Design a protein around this ligand. Structure first.
Ligand SMILES: [Cl-]
Ligand SMILES: [Cl-]
Ligand SMILES: [Cl-]
Ligand SMILES: [Cl-]
Ligand SMILES: [Cl-]
Ligand SMILES: [Cl-]
Ligand SMILES: [Cl-]
Ligand SMILES: [Cl-]
Ligand SMILES: [Cl-]
Ligand SMILES: [Cl-]
Ligand SMILES: [Cl-]
Lengths: 89, 89, 89
C-alpha cells in the first residue's frame, strides 16, 4: 500500500512533534466541593483526592472515587477535594 | 469526500494506536510542605491535593487553591500535599 | 507539494480534535493499600496522597514518597492512599 504507507509515515512524523508539545501543556485542576451533612460529591469528570469533615471528625471514607462520606454521628459538613486533568493548561 | 474520509480514518487509527505510548511518560509527582502553625502553602506550579493537621484535627480548608488551613484551636503544625504533572526523563 | 501540504493540514486539524477528546478519557485513579503493622507502600508508577493508621493512631509520615509509616507504638494496620493517571475508555 505505497500511498497508505507514505501517508502513514507522514502522520507518524507529525504526531512525533504534536504529542510532546500538547502533553507538556496538560495541567491539573483541583477544587473543593463542600456540603452540609455527611456526604460531599465530586463532579462527573473528576476524582476524589481527599476529604475533610467538620466538628474535627477524623473518620471518613471515599465511595467509588466520587463521594466523601464523613462517618461521625454528629457531622455538620463534609468536603471533597476533586481533581481532573485540564488540556492546554 | 471519499479520499478525505479514508485519510481521516487513517489519522484516527494511527492516533488511537500511538496515543498510549505517547502519554506513558506523564505522571503525578507529589511532595509535602509542612509548617509550624495553622497554614502550609504549596509552591507556584503545583496543586493542593490534600491537607493534614497536627494533633487530632480532621477539619481543614484550602485558601485560594494554594494554602492548607487547619481549623481546630491550637494546632501545632500543618502539612499540604502538593502535586504536579511531570513528563519523562 | 500541494497534496503533502493538504494532508499535513488535515493531520494537524484532526490532531486538535482528537487530542482533547483523548485526554477526557484519562482520570486520576486512586486506591488504598492496607498492610498489617506500621508500613504500607504504594506501588511503582503511583504517588502517595496520604496515610491512615486506624482509630487508634493519627501520627504518620511518608518515606521516600512511597511508604506510609504510622508512628504510634501499637499499630494493627497501616493504609496508604495511592494515585496514578489511568485511561478509561
Ligand atoms: Cl497545547
Ligand atoms: Cl474509592
Ligand atoms: Cl503561563
Ligand atoms: Cl509524547
Ligand atoms: Cl512559590
Ligand atoms: Cl493564607
Ligand atoms: Cl508539510
Ligand atoms: Cl522501621
Ligand atoms: Cl511526610
Ligand atoms: Cl480504556
Ligand atoms: Cl475504545
Amino acid at each position: 500500500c505505497p500511498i497508505d504507507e507514505a501517508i502513514d509515515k507522514k502522520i507518524k512524523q507529525d504526531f512525533n512533534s504534536l504529542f510532546p508539545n500538547a502533553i507538556k501543556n496538560i495541567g491539573l485542576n483541583c477544587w473543593t466541593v463542600s456540603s452540609r451533612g455527611k456526604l460531599a460529591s465530586c463532579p462527573e469528570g473528576t476524582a476524589v483526592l481527599s476529604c475533610s469533615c467538620g466538628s474535627a471528625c477524623g473518620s471518613w471514607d471515599i465511595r467509588e472515587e466520587k463521594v466523601c462520606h464523613c462517618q461521625c454521628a454528629r457531622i455538620d459538613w463534609t468536603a471533597a477535594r476533586c481533581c481532573k486533568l485540564q488540556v492546554a493548561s
